Ligand binder design. Structure first.
Ligand SMILES: Nc1ncnc2c1ncn2[C@@H]1O[C@H](CSCC[C@H](N)C(=O)O)[C@@H](O)[C@H]1O
Ligand SMILES: Nc1ncnc2c1ncn2[C@@H]1O[C@H](CSCC[C@H](N)C(=O)O)[C@@H](O)[C@H]1O
Lengths: 213, 213
């Protein structure tokens, strides 16, 4: 039921999640070591495992309640660990072929977003990839209003239980998002050699950066 | 026939054309004057008319055989004119509230792309909007290969008659695409106050610029 509600709250869910799965599957070996930052119930891990049965996934998140949902989903998988940690805590050593994230880093202050991309590159092997599926701000307040009408169109066409869209609205007034080109530039500053926006549906986008390639 | 085959050849058709319709509908009045550049059989114009029944449409294209198809689709539509004209020819005076384009400007050399953006802004009213649904090149040759596997992934999942993808591959030898951020910078250079990439699916992207807003 949780899986259906995310599809309802996020436009072009398949396109954007899928694009994170595909860019990782064309960047990394079948036996890659992957870190999922703020994995929550571990949906992005799920999509990755569906593509890459032989990959070793570390799921990390500050919320023990969210990771117990992840643990449930991955009950009978041997190649899946869990790590209780804040994004601002020392990252695991790795190294990792891939670090992936969905809808988490927009909860950090801008400066801590720049400090995280630099620390993520340190635990990435050469040729490794960083993939973010992210809530982005429009570049002007006029466009932000258009972004909002488009997100709200998708939610209502999806027949979202109102109680759940009202909650959605409230979680969103603590968010600290930014335009997708500011974030992508920060990848370049942190030293990723190549950074690109792969797919986008107004307020949501999949971007990636590569360490060497 | 034709309409189904475009859905087959073009990932995220509904998202990409749809985002062109929706950014125009939130940018211009119901009675806006719209120019469709390289309108072809005039599928973008159709989408726009479905959304804006009181808008005045001018469909322009160098190919008279394409515009014959457009004339057929708009047989019974009184607010629809046609203009046979090259992108390099003097644009109609207008003014227009919107100038829209789908899968045409990528056929120009890069400097004639920059020159067209500049001439297009001159025929737009203040606060008018330029929208391009476009074939874009990745920023690296390695990513270009990935964009190509994603476009080829959709075509085969869409059960495309091979004879038609064959043709597709050849027409693509005369294409002069460039990455989406270069093009969007050129809107800013040509004097649009705001430019943004709305939606994207690897090799296809919807972007826009605003003349004053
Ligand atoms: N500073 C921080 N450090 C670690 N995790 C954080 C965090 N701020 C938020 N989170 C976690 O980030 C998650 C964002 S919700 C999205 C979760 C999941 N990846 C999905 O896409 O469906 C939550 O589980 C939340 O607990
Ligand atoms: N230099 C040019 N001037 C005008 N139209 C051009 C052009 N180069 C290509 N075109 C036109 O651009 C079209 C490319 S196909 C895209 C057709 C239509 N816009 C759609 O959404 O499907 C063809 O109709 C072709 O004649």
């Amino acid at each position: 039921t949780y899986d259906a509600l995310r599809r309802q709250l996020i436009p072009s869910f398949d396109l954007l999640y899928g694009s994170a799965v595909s860019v990782v599957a064309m960047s990394v070996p079948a036996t890659a070591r992957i870190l999922d930052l703020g994995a929550g119930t571990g949906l992005l891990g799920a999509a990755l495992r569906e593509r890459l049965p032989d990959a070793e996934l570390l799921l990390q998140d500050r919320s023990q309640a969210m990771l117990e949902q992840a643990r449930q989903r991955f009950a009978d998988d041997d190649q899946v660990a869990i790590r209780v940690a804040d994004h601002l805590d020392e990252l695991p050593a790795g190294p990792f072929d891939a670090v992936v994230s969905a809808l988490s880093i927009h909860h950090l202050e801008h400066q801590d977003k720049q400090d995280l991309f630099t620390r993520i590159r340190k635990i990435l092997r050469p040729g490794g990839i960083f993939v973010n599926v992210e809530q982005v701000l429009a570049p002007t307040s006029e466009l932000e209003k258009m972004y909002d009408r488009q997100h709200e169109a998708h939610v209502l066409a999806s027949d979202t239980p109102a109680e759940e869209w009202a909650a959605g609205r409230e979680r969103m007034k603590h968010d600290i998002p930014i335009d997708v080109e500011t974030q992508i530039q920060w990848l370049r500053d942190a030293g990723f050699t190549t950074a690109d926006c792969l797919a986008k549906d107004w307020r949501f986008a999949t971007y990636a950066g590569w360490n060497g390639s």
